[model samples]
Each structure stands twice: as structure tokens, then as C-alpha cells.
Target: MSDNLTELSQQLHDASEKKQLTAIAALAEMGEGGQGILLDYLAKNVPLEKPVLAVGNVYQTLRNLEQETITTQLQRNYPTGIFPLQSAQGIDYLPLQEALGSQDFETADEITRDKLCELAGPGASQRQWLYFTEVEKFPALDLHTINALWWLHSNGNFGFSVQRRLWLASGKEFTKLWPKIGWKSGNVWTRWPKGFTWDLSAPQGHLPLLNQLRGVRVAESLYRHPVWSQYGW
Candidate 1:
């Protein structure tokens, strides 16, 4: 990394270390000073072993910086306005964001499942269907909106697309991934309600999802799904 980027990164890191959320936003707003370059460097330069935790932090930092811009703009436009149910993609994200913003993980989980169901299409079969072949037909905008919302709200903690990166790091070993993210303990998988955790302190791959809890089998399909791969995960 260049000295300039290193200096800016240190500033951001210091703000984070100091627990200065406000300052973090202020520093991120200086992105024209090479925030994108720093992010690109971090994304491409993670260490080999256990790259999931390493790369996940890189992504979370990038998302945090980007979120400052999004949140600022949203606050500017919306002000006292409510989040829209139907985004430009014609998907209902209002409930998802509403639940997320309020830190209600359980309700957010509920809204996420319902919204995903809406996108997956009608009928019970479509709800559980997410084969890579079928996933190609899934609506890109809807997927993008869902991922972006989770990425933005949780500061990158909970996102299917985001989790796909960690899954890739584990070489797509679903069984091996559970414990890494606190989704499993010993011989038993974490149950719903009690298993899920909200807030940024949760494990890197946790949050804003219902697959493990709801038994949605398509979590692995996300690896091949264009929704996340396009982001270069």
C-alpha cells in the first residue's frame, strides 16, 4: 500500500479502535483521498490460512466506508421519510430495513424470509428452490437490493452474498463453516430463536439471514449465484 493510503487507513483504524463511529463516518467521507484503492488492496491481499476472517474484515471495512455515503444520502433525502416497501426493483425491503434498523434480529429474520419467498416466486416449491441453474434466473435487482440492505445495515455482519465469500474460503465445506461463525456447537447445529444473534458483535457470517434457521438449502448455491460472485468474492 502507498504511504497515503496507509496513513488514511491508519486514521480509519484509529477511529474504529477509539470507538468513534461518528469520526469513522467523517473519515470515510474523505474517500476521494484513496479509500477505494485501500479497499482494493485489502481485498486482494489477504493471507492464505483462514482467509475468511481476514477478508471478511476487509469487506466489512469497505462496506462501512461505503455505508457512510449511503446513510448520509438516505438521511438527506428521506429526513423524516419512511423507508420504502417497494424499492425501485419492485421488492418490499421496507420491513427488512425497518426490522434491521431497530436491531430486532428475530423480526428481521422473519421479514428476510418472506421477502426472499416473494422474490423466489409463488408456490411452496419455489420457496426451497435455489439450484445454481435456477438461481441464474433469479432477479438480479432483487438480489442486489437484499444483499445491499443487509450489507449496509449490519455494517457487513449479515449478508448471504457476504457469507458466500467465507464459504468459498472454507472451500465450500458447509459442515466446516458452522463453528467458524458460531452457527454450530459440538455435535448439534444452532437452533433458531436461541441460536441467532443480532448486532455487529456477532460472528462475521451471522445476521440478516434465515437459511440455517429456516432450513433453506440454497446457502451453498449462492457461491455459483451471480448475485454475489459478481462482486468478485
Candidate 2:
């Protein structure tokens, strides 16, 4: 909060919608400066009407911003490039957000699982996975935040919504959905760790994967959950 960053953040807060985007690129370019200042501004929820539009634009740019440097610069402990990450459970998604921002999809997927487990409650956390019944209770906010992180990091190339759409498009047929997402070919399933694509180059919506080797029921519960339609995810 030096005069420099203070002045910088104020400029960002006061920027016009279009100008805020320019400022976002500038802040994002500042590496830590860009991310830290904005993180403070958004997380603190500066009360405003005009700047609220600015904040919305900030989030819009974030969703689309493979904007190059903003991607790397905003990879901070806080949810740097992400917005509207409210959790009904007050969950912290730092590990998940940083993993995706850095394009570590493997780690990101693991964090997704952990977050889902935590979201499902203590027993699931202890068991290290979820049962289908538990998914119904999953809060819309946490699920949205999780999906938003994936969408932000991958330029809309990955996330539950993307997968959900793919699933439905395949006529809700797992036989068709699997290979379409590169999850399988013919009869073989995508192997764990080494076999899955761990970057944006993978098939769209190929992430936030839930392994069905244990069972498909949990995965089914996930895609069918009401959260998707509620947010239009």
C-alpha cells in the first residue's frame, strides 16, 4: 500500500469500463503490482456503482485473458485473475486457482477433486472422494468459483460447464462423450496422470476430471447437479 500502488489502484478503481481493461493489462503487466493491487480492490468489495461496472469488466477480461502477461503476473496466492469467487462455505481456492493460472492442469484437477470433497463435507474429505448423494448438497457458489477458475485459466477451453455441454451434446451417452473429450478411444480409457492432456491444447472441456473407475455415479451426480443451469454455466 505504498503511495505508488495506492495511486495505481485508485486509477484502476476510477477507470472507465474500456480504460479499466487497459489498466488491467497495465496492472497485470506489473506482475505482482498488477495482481496485488487489483486483488485488494476486488476482494475488499469497494462499495460503488460505476466501479462495479469496472469490476465486472475486470472479471470479463479475466475470463478471456490469455491476454498473455496477465496470465503469468496474476498467478498469486490470492485469487489474482479471478473474480466473484464467493464460497457459501468460505472455502479458500488459492491452491486450485494458482495451479490453473500456472497451467498445471494435473495439479488443478487434483485441487478440483479436493475442493469437491471438502464441499461434500467431512466424511468425504476423510474418504478423499465423493458419493453421488453428497453432490446434491454442493453449494452453487463454490461450484461456480471452481468452474470459473477453470474457465478463466483455459480461455473457455475447460471446465464443468464445457464438459456438461459436451455430455448433453453427445445425447447424454457416455459411450459417445468419453472419446469426444479424449477420455477414451475405442475401448481404452485415458490413463491417469501421463495419458491425460494437461494443457489448453487438449480437447475442450476435457478437465476437472472425475475418474469413473471407482464409479460413474459421482460423475453423473456432478453434471446433473442444478448448479449448471442456475448460473447458466
Candidate 3:
């Protein structure tokens, strides 16, 4: 590795190991955004000609606590195909649909919580929460969701910040540990690094059954979680 790359990686690793939220904040400030102090330095020193790889590994580190890589679990009680698409009838969501229509995050969360418990066979809800917590760690995920919905309409960045703040403002305690991998920011830059582009918007895509299977499979394969794994991924 180049000296600049080595130095930056080490810094990131150290901050994560110490669970230094402040240091993490500072590092994020230094590396991302137009005001990033080391932005120019990093561009000048690190190679930027090729596509950045290892992005997948970074995302894995940021996964929810109960998040499982998709896979078929041996713990599955019966010889059944995994990834069942719940029947429209099986999906009892009158209450949830109402809450979602009302723009209620808490009610939505609760309804989803119950749906998970009800549909789950065994150990299902716990595993779901593991991933739910993982989903909670990054506030951007919800913003991305809202952004997509807004795109369907012509609404601008409306109450996005408020909703996000409220979501975090609940003051639920989260571990201060920084993710060892994952890009701090994917925001755009038209200038340096020979036309490096940043996308501040949320990522979009369908989690098709196959892709869902893949995630579950990977998580299940790697799962060593003492209790969650026992129930199957």
C-alpha cells in the first residue's frame, strides 16, 4: 500500500478500536465534504484511477447486530424452501397500513415489530431485531427511504432533517464503536481525483427474493451468533 493509504487506514482502525465517537466525527469531517481538510492531500497521494473495491466488506461491518447474511439454515425444522413470499392474506397489516399512511414512525416501527413476531416461526423476531438495530445505526437509511418516496412526488428535501432528528432524538443508547469498514461519505466532487463523483442521495434498488436469499445466505453462513443462529437464518 502507498504511504498515504496506509496512514489513513491506520487512523480509521485506531478510531474504531477505541470506540472514539469524537475521533470518528473528526475523521469523518477530515475525509468527506468540500471542507474536508485532507481531501486534496488524499487525492494527491492515493491512487484514484481505478474503481474502489472492497466496498462490500465495508458494508458488512455496518450491518445490524442481528443481520444475517442470507442463507438456508440447517436449523430449519422442515424440508421447506426458504424465502417464502408471505401471502397477501398472510400479511395482516390493516393497522400498519393505517400508521404508515399517517406518517407515524413509531407506530410503523411497532406494527412492523409485531408483524415480525407474528409471521416468524421461531427465533425469527430476534434475528429480525439484530438486523433492525443494524439498520438503526446509520440514520441515512431512513432518509434514503423518504427521499425515494419524495421522488415519486415533486416534494423537495421537506421535513427530512426533522424526521431524522426525531428518529435519533429518541435518545436510545447505541454503541459508540465506529464501523471498521464502509465509506464515510459518497457525496460528489466534480473536481479532484480526475472527476471523482459523489452521490449524496440514498441508494435505490429492489431486494428481490434472490438478492434477499443471498444476504440471508451469507449472514447464515457466517453466523456464529449463539442463540440467533439456533433458530435458523
TM-score of structure candidate 3? 0.22
Q: How should the candidates be ordered by lDDT, best one leading?
A: 2, 1, 3
- After aligning candidate 1 to the native by TM-score, how far in Å is the CA of 152 from where it should be? 0.8
TM per candidate: 0.60, 0.69, 0.22
Give candidate 2 regions above 4 Å deviation.
1-79
Question: Is candidate 1 or 2 superior in TM-score?
Answer: 2
Question: How well is each residue in 1-233 modelled by candidate 2, as lDDT tens digits?
Answer: 23355556667777466655567666655656667666565556522211144554444455344765554443442344545456899888877866765678899998889888888889999989788899977887888888877876676778888888999998999788889889898988889878998877899888988788777787788899898988777
Highest TM-score model number: 2
Give one digit per residue, the lDDT tens place, for model 3 in 36-122. Answer: 322332323222222111211121112111223211121132122111222322554445433333334344445544554444334
Against the reference, the lDDT scores of all candidates come to 0.56, 0.72, 0.28
| Each model's backbone clash number | 0, 1, 18
Question: Lowest summed lDDT over 10 consecutive residues: which window, candidate 1?
Answer: 47-56
Across 83-168, the per-residue lDDT of candidate 1 in tens digits comes to 22334337657667656555566787777767666666665336553344444566665666666556655656677766777777
Clashing pairs in 1: none
Q: How far off is residue 97 in model 2, in Å? A: 1.0
lDDT of 2 at 69: 56
**Model 1, TM vs. native:** 0.60
Model 1 accuracy (lDDT, Cα): 0.56
